[PDB]
Amino acid sequence: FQGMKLKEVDRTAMQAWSPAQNHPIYLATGTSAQQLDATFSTNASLEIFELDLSDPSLDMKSCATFSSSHRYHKLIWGPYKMDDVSGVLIAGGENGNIILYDPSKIIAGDKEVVIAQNDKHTGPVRALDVNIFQTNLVASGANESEIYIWDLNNFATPMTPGAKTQPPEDISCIAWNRQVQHILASASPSGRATVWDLRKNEPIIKVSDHSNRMHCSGLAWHPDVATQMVLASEDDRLPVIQMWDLRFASSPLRVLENHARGILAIAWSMADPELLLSCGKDAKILCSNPNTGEVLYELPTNTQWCFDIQWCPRNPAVLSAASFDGRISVYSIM
Amino acid sequence: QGMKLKEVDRTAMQAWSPAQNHPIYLATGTSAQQLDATFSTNASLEIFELDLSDPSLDMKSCATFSSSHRYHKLIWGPYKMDSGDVSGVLIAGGENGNIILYDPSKIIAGDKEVVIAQNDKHTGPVRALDVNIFQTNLVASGANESEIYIWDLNNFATPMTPGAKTQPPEDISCIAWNRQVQHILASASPSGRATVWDLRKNEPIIKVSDHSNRMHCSGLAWHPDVATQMVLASEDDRLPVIQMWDLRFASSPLRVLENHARGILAIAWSMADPELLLSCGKDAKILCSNPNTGEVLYELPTNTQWCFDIQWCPRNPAVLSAASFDGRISVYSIM
Amino acid sequence: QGMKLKEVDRTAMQAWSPAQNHPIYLATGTSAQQLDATFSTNASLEIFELDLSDPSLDMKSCATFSSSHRYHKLIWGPYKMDSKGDVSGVLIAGGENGNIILYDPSKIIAGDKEVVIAQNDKHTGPVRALDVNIFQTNLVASGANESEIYIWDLNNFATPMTPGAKTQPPEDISCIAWNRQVQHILASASPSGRATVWDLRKNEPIIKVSDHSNRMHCSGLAWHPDVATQMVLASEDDRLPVIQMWDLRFASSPLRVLENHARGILAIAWSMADPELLLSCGKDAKILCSNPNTGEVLYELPTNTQWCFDIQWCPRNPAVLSAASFDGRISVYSIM
Amino acid sequence: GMKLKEVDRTAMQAWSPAQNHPIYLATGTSAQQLASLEIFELDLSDPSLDMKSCATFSSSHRYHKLIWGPYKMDKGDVSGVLIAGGENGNIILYDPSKIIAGDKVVIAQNDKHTGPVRALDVNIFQTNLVASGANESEIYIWDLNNFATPMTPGAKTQPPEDISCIAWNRQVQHILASASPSGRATVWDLRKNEPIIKVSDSNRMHCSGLAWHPDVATQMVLASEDDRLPVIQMWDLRFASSPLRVLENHARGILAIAWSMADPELLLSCGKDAKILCSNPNTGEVLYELPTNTQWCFDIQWCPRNPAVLSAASFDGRISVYSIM
């Protein structure tokens, strides 16, 4: 349908676009954990590619490669680093590992690229998010309801948004509120979302609709409405995106079932909040309006499923989606 | 559809002769997991010739051997150190750590010296055994306390390991060599957690589990042509399923087959036609399912008795055998 | 006193896996230069494994990939862009109509559907000349028709560079070889036996050598593994069936001429482990081993009445070598 | 003597023609034992006894005879036609290039004949000519270029006898021989369309094979399956009154023979004594005994392309490929 494929990167990896203000546009990829191909290789690398739209080739220019001892569950690029290339690459590892990488030291080709490392978490660090008002704060999530808040000015000692939710469930997604800096949301695999108030240091609201049929695959806050957030489900018994308004806690405002099967990933545009990307087990990449519920268009894709999708921060027309067939594809909605 | 070709009154563990061997033989040994009303602990190893040219339901008994051990597992490897007119080794897993190697050609010949080797290196019942289809001299075994041993039939005295034993210690339910890459092994625990080992790296390279709270593992099989796909069966009635796993998306099962009313006792994935997976249920049903779609292809005709050691014939890909509750061994054809 | 260890029934271009790779593999690809005794239509990529523990003359076939290309050249490089895989390197294959293909030997051995990394057709004829730099293992030099020489970077294989302006007259590049001491030196040769030596820091040729015989047909080019300025040129012409030894410091004429074959030399392989060993196959159906520094024949490998178009030393096991003959057999031999 | 390949089939078999590459072995469900037609590829490059199965065609017929003619009227990658003799007078032509390709494969079919079609032979000179035999002295000459109506070699033998074998002369294209189960053979000249000579034994023969000498135009052998006379009779039509020599190397009846075209000094025979013997027909001497188990073989065939290779089909359900090296 709409738009087209610009670039393709054949890596089974976690992705992160460089922050909005950085030039050139960079795509960092970190070899994905809990997956194996027929080679049965656990070889991990963190690579950085440049996005050149002046070139019509499907190949991106590789800029740097770092031979990692970790495979990743999450990879984000925050706009703030404690000291050429803006920000910090924060990677969620296995066995509670959190690694901070200096992307300018990776680009340059230095030997020491790790800023700091930690293993305080238990199990896979699947959830990571940077606060947009206090760009030094990172919220992390792993097993047994572990939610840590790291200050990049003093990364050795973390904090908590309050006492751990009981019973202890894994934290699958984490997201800082886009309008009120001390509000954070966490989701569990059962679709129970918790909203923490860091001023009160305790949960202020808990919302769940199905639970019995929900399998959470995504959490996002509305870029411009403080009390509005979405929850995606991967479960084929309930293949929906629940659109919540925290003013009305009993049930979601609306439900989007635009896919034939469960939703594997979502990305809500900060540039244009009327645009919400979603990947399905029906192998469709859709763009839906979260305010109407309407499908605006479909992106041209193959028979493969995508586990991750992200809007490019510097270029709102661009997005990348990582598929299970070992490919990262870069599209334009233009 | 189905067609019963042969039947014999044996309460036993079974193993078909290797695919290259002619004629077809069905080796049986007294199960350590079933008693009769007599409470007899007497054990034997009986080998039958499958004669598909004889139209009777009877199967010719070639040889019997009096065993001191009852078995939890019985397999027949294609490779035997030094040659005999019958191919391979009979590898038996007994109680109290025992692994016994039997020479099938010496059993059939009818002589007294049939044991190639023996050892009690393992702890508890030796429930899990598998032979590597690429390096046929290599055997994986599992028992209690997370022990996995790798045996070379060319130097059977000292075992090797897939890597450091996983903690906390749990029994090894099943062991299966990968059907596409020779240094890859998978083992399963009673709760249904499968560990994938790289033998060349000497470490577990991935672990998979779903609904481990309600799972009781009764089977593990690698897909014959897809290196990253495997199935895990559950004996528990709270979750009577077959989990289809693709290691390329190892976070949860790709597909879950729920075609039985009660827990699955045994599975058998055809090497010849991977679109045929047999399963025995506690609902007194033998089903054939396509693991790539989940649908039931057909049910094999059986009575009210459970069946629990389903095995496809390596040489004739249309033939299979199932051991039953009432102490019978039935041979069927699918065509 | 060396002997035969293995034999495979293939009419193909061959390449051993790099020295760091364990186990030892022998990659073969259907030859575009030869025609099978049965005019066989099939084109395939087949990788065998070398196992000296087994006394059999039969090699274990690891993987087969039905190809849409026949090959004029096949090389196995130690470097590959993506980390994933136990099988190290890339198979770089030169084909017809200017095609260059990169295969992932790790994907082939695993038996994967798509095994191609990248592929282009910038060249204008058969890509019969290929070589990987041993100091910048991400660099490949290729050659084809009308003096075309491209330098590829496997890290960003999209655009090639040139060693300088195409040498006039525009002749076909029969061989290309990176210097085995200096990373920026490359030598190319035409079928006429005109060899051009390039320095990539200068982007111009530093020397052009020729015997000026008009009885030379270039079949091979190799740099001395220990001496920067030394290199050999082999001739397939039955009138002048020699291997010329050039020292580019004293380039008025060749330093010495190895005249051990009664008929044209078809192929050469200079051992990097033992630079005192030079293999040579001829139209006199002899595979000889000579000391290039003395011109002395050390040994003749026992062979049939059949000719070999390709001979290669095993990088991981220096004593082992393989020879591909026109009679559709690739034979693996030993020397110690 | 070395086993190369083994296939678990109780079937009639036919090797691909001499000019065809690769070497194929076609098999078809036997009607003389207790349905489908498969083509396997002989890959002597592979060390295992396992043969690569290319295609399987589900047929509604069982076969009494399966031959592979080198000529095809049509234009695929595989040479010739597979000609099968079935039950109830069936003669079926199959396209082997279409079987191999995966196509849905019958060129022509007819049930002109009465009873089992146990005798089939393709002429090596006029390769479009196929001779068949069934019950009641029926001999038909089929032309693959005009298959619809057959020809006869002349008037049906009286009293009527079923045709157990049929063989075209290997030196003269218009000469053909037919043999009844009693071992009474008739030679027909198709220029005259009449029998030219008849040869027979004592009433102890059960004919199991008829074969002409590849190099001598007047010589042919008749094999006997009956245990009362377990012999191969060497006939020379230069003296048609009594055999030239009798070959009695088996302790029991001969089930099948295969006379090498590449080397006519090599005649294969398998018996109920469970031996596969190679003999020089011109001296009656046993040159080699192919090593086997105690199982009988009902069909033996030399490989047209690789003269050192042969295949024998057993009653115990296995078709084995051997080397006489």
Chain B residues lying within 8 Å of C86, measured CB to CB: 200
Residue C112 is nearest to which of A38, A61, A62, comparing CB atoms? A38
Cβ–Cβ gap C86/A41 under 8 Å: yes
Are B298 and B289 within 8 A, CB to CB? no
What's the per-residue H, E or C state across C128-193?
CEEEECCCCCCEEEEECCCCCEEEEECCCCCCCECCCCCCCCCCCCCEEEECCCCCCEEEEECCCC
How do strand D139-143 and strand B128-131 relate by DSSP bridges?
unpaired
Helix (H, G, I), strand (E, B) or coil at D262: coil
> Which residue is associated with the tokens 């590892």?
A93
Helix (H, G, I), strand (E, B) or coil at D300: strand
Q: Does the N-terminal peptide bond of residue B23 adopt cis geometry, omega within 30 degrees of 0?
A: yes
How crowded is the C-beta side of D32, counted as CA atoms within 13 Å? Answer: 20
Six token digits for residue A232: 């995606």
Q: From CA A91, how far away is CA C83, in angstroms rounded?
A: 19
Q: From CA D140, how far away is CA D134, in angstroms rounded?
A: 9
Q: From CA A168, how far away is CA A190, in angstroms rounded?
A: 12
- Residue B148, amino acid: I
Could you tell me which of B91, B169, B89 has the C-alpha nearest to residue B128?
Answer: B91
Residue B219, beta-bridge partner list: B233
Could you tell me which of D186, D182, D275 has the C-alpha nearest to residue D229?
Answer: D182
Q: Is C83 on the interface with A (CB under 8 A)?
A: yes
> Which residue is associated with the tokens 């004739």?
B316
Q: How far is CA D223 from CA D226, D244, D278, D311, in A?
A: 9, 14, 14, 18
Q: From CA A242, how far away is CA A173, in angstroms rounded?
A: 15
Q: Is B144 on the interface with A (CB under 8 A)?
A: no
- Residue B335, amino acid: M
Are A168 and A161 within 8 A, CB to CB? no
Six token digits for residue D245: 């020599």
How do strand D52-58 and strand A216-221 relate by DSSP bridges?
unpaired
What's the per-residue H, E or C state across D122-142?
ECCCCCCEEEEECCCCCEEEE
Q: How far is CA A136 from CA A20, A310, D176, in A?
A: 16, 22, 99
Interface test with A, best of C62, C81, C84 (most A CBs within 10 A): C84
Distance from CA of D53 to the nearest CA of B (A): 12
Domain B3-333: give its CATH superfamily. Answer: YVTN repeat-like/Quinoprotein amine dehydrogenase (2.130.10.10)
Q: Is A212 on the interface with B (CB under 8 A)?
A: no
Alpha helices in chain C, H assignment, sequence order? 105-110
Residue D8 is nearest to which of B53, B55, B315, comparing CB atoms? B315
Helix (H, G, I), strand (E, B) or coil at D274: coil
How do strand C24-30 and strand C12-16 relate by DSSP bridges?
antiparallel
Q: From CA C240, how far away is CA D31, in angstroms rounded?
A: 69
Chain A residues lying within 8 Å of C156, measured CB to CB: 59, 61-62
Helices and strands, counts by H and E, chain C: 1, 27
**Radius of gyration, alpha carbons of chain C:** 19
Q: From CA B179, how far away is CA B134, in angstroms rounded?
A: 8
> Which residue is associated with the tokens 């047994």?
A144
Distance from CA of B242 to the nearest CA of C (A): 26
Distance from CA of C25 to the nearest CA of D (A): 18
Are C27 and C91 within 8 A, CB to CB? yes
Six token digits for residue A165: 């939710």
Helix (H, G, I), strand (E, B) or coil at D282: coil
Six token digits for residue D188: 């027909």
Q: Does the N-terminal peptide bond of residue D307 adopt cis geometry, omega within 30 degrees of 0?
A: no
Chain A residues lying within 8 Å of C83, measured CB to CB: 31, 41, 43-45, 65, 67
- Residue C72, amino acid: H
Are C272 and C265 within 8 A, CB to CB? no
Kindly report the backbone phi and psi dihedral angles of residue B247, in degrees, each rounded to the nearest multiple of 5, phi listed first.
-65, -10
**Cα C187–C192–C193 angle (5° rounding)?**
40
Chain D residues lying within 8 Å of B20, measured CB to CB: 49
User: Which of 3.40.50.300, 2.130.10.10, 2.40.340.10, 3.10.150.10 would CATH assign to domain A4-332?
Assistant: 2.130.10.10
What's the per-residue H, E or C state across chain A?
CCCEEEEEECCCEEEEECCCCCCCCEEEEEEECCCCCCCCCCCEEEEEEECCCCCCCCCCEEEEEEEECCCECEEEEECCCCCCCCCEEEEECCCCCEEEECHHHHHHCCCCCEEEEECCCCCCCCEEEECCCCCCEEEEECCCCCEEEEECCCCCCCECCCCCCCCCCCCCEEEECCCCCCEEEEECCCCCEEEEECCCCEEEEEECCCCCCCCEEEEEECCCCCCEEEEEECCCCCCCEEEEECCCCCCCCEEECCCCCCEEEEEECCCCCCCEEEEECCCCEEEECCCCCCEEEEECCCCCCEEEEEECCCCCCEEEEEECCCEEEEEECC
Chain A residues lying within 8 Å of C86, measured CB to CB: 39-41
Cβ–Cβ gap B181/A38 under 8 Å: yes
User: Which of 1.10.645.10, 2.130.10.10, 3.40.1190.20, 1.10.3470.10 would CATH assign to domain D2-323?
Assistant: 2.130.10.10
Q: Is C114 on the interface with B (CB under 8 A)?
A: no
Q: Is the dihedral of CA B248, B249, B251, B256 positive or negative?
A: negative
Cβ–Cβ gap B228/A42 under 8 Å: no
Cβ–Cβ gap B227/C86 under 8 Å: no
Q: Is C111 on the interface with A (CB under 8 A)?
A: yes
Interface test with B, best of A40, A69, A71, A327 (most B CBs within 10 A): A40
Q: From CA B46, how far away is CA B50, in angstroms rounded?
A: 13
Q: How many contacts does C have with D, using Cβ atoms within 8 A?
A: 6
Q: From CA C180, how far away is CA C272, in angstroms rounded?
A: 9
Q: From CA C225, how far away is CA A293, in angstroms rounded?
A: 70
Cβ–Cβ gap C158/A62 under 8 Å: no
Chain C residues lying within 8 Å of B181, measured CB to CB: 110
CATH 2.130.10.10 fits C4-334, yes or no: yes
Chain B residues lying within 8 Å of D34, measured CB to CB: 53, 55
D 165-204: CB under 8 A from C: none
C-alpha D5, offset from chain centre: 20
Helix (H, G, I), strand (E, B) or coil at B164: coil
Q: From CA A133, how far away is CA B89, in angstroms rounded?
A: 70
Could you tell me which of A216, A203, A229 has the C-alpha nearest to residue A172?
Answer: A216
CB burial string C164-178: b at 16+ within 10 A, e below: eeebeeebbbbbbbb
Q: What is the DSSP code string of B121-159? A: -S-S---EEEE-SSSTTEEEEE-STT-EEEEETTSTTS-
Q: From CA B30, how far away is CA B43, in angstroms rounded?
A: 5
D 47-76: CB under 8 A from B: 49
Cβ–Cβ gap D8/B316 under 8 Å: yes
Q: What is the enclosing helix (H) or strand (E) of C321? A: strand C321-325
C329 → chain D, closest CA residue: D45
Helix (H, G, I), strand (E, B) or coil at D120: strand
Six token digits for residue A225: 């409405």
- Determination technique for this PDB entry? X-ray
Q: Do chains B and A touch (3 or more CB pairs under 8 A)?
A: yes
Q: Do chains A and D touch (3 or more CB pairs under 8 A)?
A: no
Are A288 and A266 within 8 A, CB to CB? no
Q: From CA B172, how far away is CA B187, in angstroms rounded?
A: 7
- Phi-psi category of residue B57: left, alpha or beta, with phi > 0 → left and psi -120 to 50 → alpha: alpha
Are B221 and B231 within 8 A, CB to CB? yes
Cβ–Cβ gap A36/B248 under 8 Å: yes
B198: Cβ–Cβ under 8 A, 6 or more apart, which residues? A40, A42, B183, B184, B204, B205
For residue C162, the tally of other CB atoms under 10 A from its CB is 14
Longest dimension (CA), chain B: 53
Q: Is C23 on the interface with B (CB under 8 A)?
A: no
Distance from CA of A135 to the nearest CA of B (A): 31
Distance from CA of D3 to the nearest CA of C (A): 17
Q: What is the DSSP code string of C44-56? A: EEEEEEE-TTS--
How crowded is the C-beta side of C210, counted as CA atoms within 13 Å? Answer: 13
Six token digits for residue A191: 């679709």
Q: Is D21 on the interface with C (CB under 8 A)?
A: yes
CB burial string A79-106: b at 16+ within 10 A, e below: bbbeeebbbbbbbbbbebbbbbbbbbbb
Q: Is D295 on the interface with B (CB under 8 A)?
A: no
Q: How far is CA A268 from CA A15, A128, A314, B316, in A?
A: 16, 16, 15, 57
Helices and strands, counts by H and E, chain D: 1, 27
Six token digits for residue D131: 């001779």
Chain C residues lying within 8 Å of B227, measured CB to CB: 110-111
Six token digits for residue A255: 């439900």
Six token digits for residue C309: 């178009």
What's the per-residue H, E or C state across A75-99?
EEEECCCCCCCCCEEEEECCCCCEE
Distance from CA of A101 to the nearest CA of C (A): 19
> Which residue is associated with the tokens 């390197």?
C89
Q: From CA B221, how far away is CA A179, in angstroms rounded?
A: 51
B314 → chain D, closest CA residue: D8
Are C265 and C241 within 8 A, CB to CB? yes
CB burial string C28-56: b at 16+ within 10 A, e below: bbbbbbbeeeeeeeebebbbbebeeeeee
Kindly report the backbone phi and psi dihedral angles of residue B246, in degrees, each rounded to the nearest multiple of 5, phi listed first.
-115, 115
Distance from CA of C104 to the nearest CA of A (A): 11
All chains having 3 or more CB pairs closer than 8 angstroms to chain D: B, C
Name the residue ranges covered by the structural domains of chain A.
Answer: 4-332
For residue A29, the tally of other CB atoms under 10 A from its CB is 24
Could you tell me which of A259, A276, A273, A281 has the C-alpha nearest to residue A310?
Answer: A276
Are C237 and C213 within 8 A, CB to CB? no
Q: From CA A106, how far away is CA A75, in angstroms rounded?
A: 15
Q: From CA B230, how far away is CA B227, in angstroms rounded?
A: 8
D25: Cβ–Cβ under 8 A, 6 or more apart, which residues? D7, D13, D14, D15, D16, D39, D40, D41, D42, D51, D311, D319, D321
Interface test with B, best of A10, A12, A36 (most B CBs within 10 A): A36
Residue C50, beta-bridge partner list: C24
Q: Is the dihedral of CA D115, D119, D123, D127 positive or negative?
A: positive
C217: Cβ–Cβ under 8 A, 6 or more apart, which residues? C191, C192, C193, C235, C236, C237, C264
DSSP annotation of C234: E
Residue A263, beta-bridge partner list: A280
Distance from CA of A66 to the nearest CA of C (A): 10
For residue D267, the tally of other CB atoms under 10 A from its CB is 27
Residues in chain A: 334
Kindly report the backbone phi and psi dihedral angles of residue C4, in degrees, each rounded to the nearest multiple of 5, phi listed first.
-80, 135
Q: Is D316 on the interface with B (CB under 8 A)?
A: yes
Q: Does the N-terminal peptide bond of residue D22 adopt cis geometry, omega within 30 degrees of 0?
A: yes
DSSP annotation of C17: P
